[PDB]
Design a protein around this nucleic acid. Structure first.
Lengths: 258, 259
DNA sequence: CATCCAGGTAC
DNA sequence: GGTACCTGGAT
């Protein structure tokens, strides 16, 4: 509940960090005990899947966030702060934190599955430029990637995707250009409106697997199945498009093979 | 700006005149047609009238007009008791979309002035079996010409502020190169004073032929490049392919004259 | 519908 | 400190 507000700070700096809010959400939803029953039925009769857990956590975290946002809004308006700037700040916070929340939830799932990873580490492309490529996750480590890219997984994760899936194509290209075509680059989106073209385009242009929010999987696969063309390798796309829920065991499977 | 008739039963932003209209208003207000007549000549103040300066000035004026309209709409919706959070979100979303569109429109105005034929809104189909495809902001001179001979056309991707979204262009370029081969001409234009050296270099090494930067950033960007002291870095290779925004118009002219 | 990001926030 | 986020609607 009640935040200490410091109005000398940018309003959103008064809002607890996303990791804290996720931890709050995890505690409030009893997610750890829920995670102990992954792939079993919950009391409502739904299978406890990583995608459902992620969605529930992302919603609860947002609710908690919104409470904090309200507190900050009220404080800052009481201080005379521009409403327009405040709302802009909040929207920008929501974008950043919405993404971060999903990323953090992803790591909580990696952790549960005992998957070794490194997060937001920069893969240098030019040794003389500090800036490089920063997959969301490198599994198991950047060391393993650099020594044998075929043995590591690079995962980029996005919540809503819009046209931004092309960023993943670009990242994959930069990395493939440097490290060769043996890298493994997986895309995760968490977007019910994820498009067939984006999936096929990615899979044809340097992305090895595409993971979709579970609720989009069936309809997406049905769209793929409606296509008929000798140059359309339907089975390739069907195999390489996966439910979000499957990624964790897929990673384990991969590591066991590589 | 005019006093809008605001219908509060519409989405708030549907009461704001479209970007094309605002740009035309700005053009009139700034007498941009007279500025364009004086392109590459000195103005009264002493500064050369460049495409980038006209673009920036026009962009800023259109934004100012937009904001005046936004304020009118805001006041009307607040009087109606409309959700402030939703209103402001809607306006931010309008500003993102409109700010991009405004830059693209401004770019076309410059293209027109130079007699550069172009098409905008053309989808380059990638698959026979999907209608969706790649959508450069501009294809010069036309998508038919591109498809006839990809080497003979220029694909131009245009962004205002860039952030990480430059990788979209690398993505687009890869998709197009995969389909059409490496003889395509794919140019990136950013209108971003914070455009980064990494983005320029990575783009140029990864399917972007030419990178155009808002004029104000060109010098400092090149200086950063020059300050890479590792002798294994071949600055010349990159510097030649990084250009000021203002240069793109003559570059297109010279390209078309050659092709 | 796909693309914009008149863009600040967050780690 | 510098880059990636888009708990995202408008266009």
């Amino acid at each position: 509940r009640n935040l200490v507000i410091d109005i000398t700070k940018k309003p959103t700096q008064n809002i607890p960090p996303t990791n804290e809010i996720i931890e709050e959400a995890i505690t409030e939803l009893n997610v750890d005990e829920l995670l102990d029953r992954l792939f079993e039925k919950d009391e409502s009769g739904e299978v406890i899947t990583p995608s459902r857990i992620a969605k529930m956590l992302e919603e609860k975290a947002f609710e908690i966030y919104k409470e904090y946002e309200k507190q900050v809004r009220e404080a800052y308006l009481s201080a005379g702060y521009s409403r327009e700037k405040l709302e802009q700040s909040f929207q920008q916070a929501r974008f950043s934190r919405g993404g971060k929340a999903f990323e953090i939830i992803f790591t909580k799932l990696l952790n549960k599955f005992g998957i070794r990873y490194e997060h937001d580490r920069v893969i240098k492309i030019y040794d003389y430029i500090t800036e490089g490529e920063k997959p969301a996750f490198i599994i198991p480590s950047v060391r393993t990637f650099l020594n044998d890219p075929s043995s590591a997984i690079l995962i980029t994760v996005k919540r809503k995707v819009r046209e931004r899936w092309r960023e993943a194509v670009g990242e994959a290209q930069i990395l493939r250009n440097k490290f060769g075509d043996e890298i493994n680059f997986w895309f995760v989106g968490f977007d019910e409106e994820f498009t067939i073209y984006s999936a096929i385009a990615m899979l044809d242009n340097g992305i090895d697997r595409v993971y979709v929010i579970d609720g989009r999987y069936d309809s997406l696969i049905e769209e793929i199945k409606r296509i008929s063309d000798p140059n359309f390798n339907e089975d390739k796309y069907i195999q390489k498009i996966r439910r979000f829920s499957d990624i964790f065991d897929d990673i384990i499977q991969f590591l066991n093979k590589h």
